Write a protein that binds this ligand. Structure first.
Ligand SMILES: *Cc1c(COP(=O)(O)O)cnc(C)c1O
Ligand SMILES: *Cc1c(COP(=O)(O)O)cnc(C)c1O
Ligand code: FES
Lengths: 461, 462
């Protein structure tokens, strides 16, 4: 199920990794590569590299590995002779679904549906989930505007040649610091780092400020309320402004906690109010749970913390969910087929795995475990913040979805690189934040292994 | 390996499929659903439904099943205990690749790299392949314009807020009839059917005519050269026009044979001249082989027929390839990391399957088989066209990538329906064409089985 701690043999990347990185660099830019991995010997919370290093992995493949490496329940699925077809016969799911398609959805995604959302379409990744959510939103908005009326001849003609009125000039409102994917529609809503954006054509869609909270929260009660109120006002102003531009805001997309752009949090009140603004202007409210979804905040979906019966119109997911897709309200159902469609629409092999993942999450009480392990982590980070104010500030988190700031990008990267050599894989976000994305099998004792390693690193830095 | 023929028990969809359709329709629009399938009992070219119908499948999951159902070499891979990890431990491939990543690419995609393209990025589907190929082209074009210079402060600030100059107003030129995917960038290049496009915001990018050939080809040699010439002239004019509009054409995307829009073919000559036009105006030439790729035209990549040493700058793929991605020239290599990126960048388990598929295609000489079986099919289609000119026209194809037109949409759909109930699954494309996408284990005897069932259908059709 898991090893008893990290065990380092070499610097990371070690010589076998470096050789493999040189080979890969011949066929593509390999500069992002951390190291090469032995996934066969990886177990639980521990990633083993090709040099035999064993690291406690608190990044989990960018928050995408739900119940650790080489999970014995998932091993068993692959071993069952009856499952072989699912792995080798991939269907065009929009036209030729397997006999068990609906049942395996009942065992998996439908069992964790968000409140108010009776509909589900599956997609293979987070980007195509958000792209198709946008399109779902645009078709719904245009359908509100036309009744009743059929598509017009002018609409049918102009859409084929990329013109209005067939192709409307609607927008999705997004936030500074957001990350929603990198295909060309997703990208216009992404505002994470310039290198993600530069040299790519975009859309003129409104971009609102996301609150920047001040820490410690108890010492900034009024200021943080004011900051959130200012952002809400600017959202509403943008919706009004873009309606006058004839670039009507059909939807608002937001993450419950901004990830790639710097682990930015906002109060549950901010979200409830944002949801109400969206409804008031007839904007669909699209919650992107690709990274927050799947339990690490201590609730299956992070938006569940908000306590709403009607939390959103559309909610996308992927990463830990193995498959992508989006849940949505009945009113957003496409009116005709072949509008929201692609060849594969996910993969039944991933739904097979996810159903077992969800069973394990329920049976091992891993939601509540993530709240607990996360509190233990956060407490320890607060202790380190108090002892090392020259390096650590703005400690913050929900569940195991935790982060802190360092003084600058150069110290942020150095601390990540030293931790890795000492046996712990950390992620970065923003210009100078370190983030945690532990698998759901991360326990309080793993929080301590990390804290004790990192305490020694800070003492010697 | 295979069953010996179709076996029909019910109309399709049968009662068990209709019940599942009803259940699925509660949670999503299920109006596209053909029927529900028993993939566990499906084998080779035969698909088995939940009503126990066994149909010769000449559509192969929209041309995505490369070596048939339940292929025993693929079954063996899933059975090997050493392969479990690959199915259950999915990496973020851009940052933490598995030990065998490179070697498995050598066994698979790199063994079939097109001429002149040393670079490869992997992607999970055809649409992310094309969106990321567009981005690769836009970055390449700005790199030519800025030279070996750093991003400007203004570019870095403006790109974050969706503004020029950091976000350029460059265009990708595409063709009427095209299909390149349905995410918002891809979809701007797609011009297949109105329902695929309507109500979605787009880009003001140029759209050229794709040649519409007249059949039979021997009777319209001159008119077809003229039509191809006119299309080439309009591509070039559009490039000049969009430069003048400050919306410079950075790349041109085209399919070797247009699929979803209606199986539109053009000569090898037209593609050679198109490629030259691209080069002449400094446009990257992006060939979409998502549906033509993987052998069914009798060469691994359809563009191979053009006989060029420099056929293209970028070539995308997916469907039969199990994974997506794109090959590209060394000069198109991104200059920094995290520009072309996403969480998964494909999936090693699909690479595992693909290596074995490529092994099977080579060992069993399946490109040659597609040319041979496809000639059998096309010859029979031409024979049926001669006998039933009132139902069948514009018979055309290359390898098994064949099609024909019917007089109208209702007849096209009736013939597909009838054929299915008689044990043969066909595709439709455009408003009135029928298309073939047989898997690569389609042989001449399957072609004759089809021909012989369809002959009977035609004789009985009113
Ligand atoms: C990773 C991520 C996406 C994109 O998912 P991919 O599978 O990389 O396309 C979208 N939204 C958020 C919040 C993410 O963190
Ligand atoms: C199917 C197809 C695509 C899109 O592939 P998906 O995997 O459906 O996103 C792109 N181009 C062509 C030519 C295709 O036929
Ligand atoms: S865009 Fe999602 S898998 Fe390709």
């Amino acid at each position: 199920f898991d090893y008893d701690g990290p065990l380092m043999k070499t610097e990371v990347p070690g010589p076998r990794s470096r050789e493999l990185m040189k080979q890969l660099n011949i066929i593509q830019n390999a500069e992002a590569v951390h190291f090469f991995c032995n996934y066969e010997e990886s177990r639980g919370n521990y990633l083993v590299d090709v040099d035999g290093n064993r690291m406690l992995d608190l990044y989990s493949q960018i928050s995408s590995i739900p119940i650790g490496y080489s999970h014995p329940a998932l091993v068993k699925l692959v071993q069952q002779p009856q499952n072989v077809s699912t792995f080798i016969n991939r269907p065009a799911l929009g036209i030729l679904p397997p006999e068990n398609f609906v049942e395996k959805l009942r065992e998996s995604l439908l069992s964790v549906a968000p409140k108010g959302m009776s509909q589900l379409i599956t997609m293979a990744c987070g980007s195509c989930s958000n792209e198709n959510a946008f399109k779902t939103i645009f078709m719904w908005y245009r359908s509100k505007e036309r009744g009743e009326s059929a598509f017009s001849k002018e609409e049918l003609e102009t859409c084929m040649i990329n013109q209005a009125p067939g192709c409307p000039d609607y927008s999705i409102l997004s936030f500074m610091g957001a990350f929603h994917g990198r295909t060309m529609g997703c990208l216009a809503t992404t505002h994470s780092k310039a290198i993600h954006k530069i040299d790519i054509p975009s859309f003129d869609w409104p971009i609102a400020p996301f609150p920047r909270l001040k820490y410690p929260l108890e010492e900034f009660v009024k200021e943080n309320q004011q900051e959130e109120a200012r952002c809400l006002e600017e959202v509403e102003d943008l919706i009004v402004k873009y309606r006058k531009k004839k670039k009507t805001v059909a939807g608002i997309i937001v993450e419950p906690i901004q990830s790639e752009g710097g682990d930015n949090h906002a109060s549950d009140d901010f979200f409830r109010k944002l949801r109400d603004i969206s409804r008031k202007h007839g904007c669909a409210f699209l919650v992107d749970e690709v990274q927050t979804g799947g339990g690490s905040t201590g609730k299956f979906w992070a938006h569940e913390h908000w306590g709403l019966d009607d939390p959103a119109d559309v909610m996308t997911f992927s990463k830990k969910m193995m498959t992508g897709g989006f849940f949505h309200k009945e009113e957003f159902r496409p009116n005709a087929p072949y509008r929201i469609f692609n060849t594969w629409l996910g993969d039944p092999s991933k739904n097979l795995l996810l159903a077992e993942v969800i069973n394990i999450i329920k049976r091992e009480d891993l939601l509540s475990n993530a709240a607990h392990a996360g509190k233990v982590l956060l407490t320890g980070l607060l202790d380190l913040q108090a002892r090392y104010p020259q390096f650590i500030s703005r400690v913050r988190g929900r569940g195991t979805f935790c982060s802190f700031d360092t003084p600058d990008e150069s110290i942020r990267n150095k601390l990540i690189s030293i931790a890795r050599n000492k046996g712990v894989m950390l992620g970065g976000c923003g210009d100078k934040s370190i983030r945690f994305r532990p698998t759901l099998v991360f326990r309080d004792h793993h929080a301590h292994l990390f804290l004790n390693i990192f305490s020694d690193i800070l003492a010697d830095f």
